[PDB]
Amino acid sequence: ADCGLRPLFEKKSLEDKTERELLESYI
Amino acid sequence: IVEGSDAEIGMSPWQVMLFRKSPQELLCGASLISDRWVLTAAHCLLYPPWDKNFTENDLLVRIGKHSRTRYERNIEKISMLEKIYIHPRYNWRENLDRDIALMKLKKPVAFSDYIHPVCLPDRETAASLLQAGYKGRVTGWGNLKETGQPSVLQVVNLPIVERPVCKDSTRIRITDNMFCAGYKPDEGKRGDACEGDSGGPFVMKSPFNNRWYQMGIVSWGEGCDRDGKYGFYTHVFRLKKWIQKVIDQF
Ligand SMILES: *[C@@H]1O[C@H](CO)[C@@H](O)[C@H](O)[C@H]1NC(C)=O
Ligand code: NA
């Protein structure tokens, strides 16, 4: 319903130390 | 996890731990997909060649943990299970095809800053992201190297390998309900899951909506972080139709 939105990251508007690596791979 | 590192506080809030009750030992990793449903791999519960056939009464589940040692009061929750649902066509006698399982908790878990469910992929999500080259994320408290257990939850970021590369790297019949991931010998990077990370989640962040989708379930592999060998994962989407029926029937 409100899944996959980490309360300490996505909700608080913060990136985890290595999530850019993932999004970067889509390019 | 092999060649992975320590997770951040509440980095994988859907991360679950499957325990045996007597004695209390780490079996597999798992994932929270709703208030009452957990999704691990079938081989964790049922593997007859190793006299493995677990009842609901045999197992325990721990959600919200960071340090496997340190018990944190109103952070981590320990739940027991009402019923277990292994795939009817789970092939243990040949290739670990349809290696999926569902666990209904005896009581729903309240969500927090540390307990939170993951998204299950859709038609479009799976077709667009389940493509070779893209990196996903494996997580678990399994062995740090092959035959060595970690304190804090481990995390590795692994790229999806081309289906023909997966096929030619093993002797086992790879089915559409499997996908593999890992770095190639000349990719200059390493990492894999190990004994204990089975049943665990392979996730991805949707560039479309910033939501974490669970693409796979840590299924099988030949060793841990072996050169020319890749990790095999249960193709969650290919079985979403089954996941739905068990959730909607119970
Ligand atoms: C597992 O055990 C239960 C009873 O404890 C039985 O109904 C089931 O058929 C068993 N399955 C296998 C493959 O051993
Ligand atoms: Na490898």
Numbering used by the authors:
A (entry chain B): 1 to 27
B (entry chain A): 15 to 161, 169 to 271
Can I see the authors' text?
Here, we describe the mechanism of action of Compound 1, an exemplary VE-DTI, which acylates the active site S195 of thrombin in a transient manner (note that throughout this paper, amino acids are numbered according to the classical chymotrypsin numbering), thereby utilizing the advantages of covalent reversible inhibition. The crystal structure of thrombin seeded with Compound 1 showed electron density consistent with the 2-methoxybenzoyl group transferred to S195. A small extra electron-density peak close to S195 was found in the heavy chain of each thrombin unit. In one monomer (right), continuous electron density is found supporting the existence of a covalent linkage. However, in the other molecule (left), electron density for the methoxyphenyl ring indicates blockage of the active site, but missing electron density (red) cannot conclusively determine covalent linkage. Given the totality of the data, we believe that the missing electron density is due to partial disorder of the carbonyl linkage, rather than the chemically unreasonable fragmentation of Compound 1 into a methoxyphenyl group. The non-ideal quality of the structure is not an unexpected result as the crystallization process occurred over five days and deacylation was determined to take place with k3 = 1.4 x 10−3 min-1 (see section “Inhibition is reversible”), corresponding to a half-life of t1/2 ~ 8 h. Furthermore, due to the small size of the methoxybenzoyl group, the acylserine is likely disordered, which could also lead to the ambiguous densities observed. An interaction diagram indicates that no specific contacts with thrombin are being made, including a lack of contact between the acylserine carbonyl and the oxyanion hole formed by G193 and S195. The proposed mechanism of action for Compound 1 is that initial binding of the compound to thrombin is followed by covalent modification of the catalytic S195 required for thrombin proteolytic activity by acyl transfer of the 2-methoxybenzoyl group.
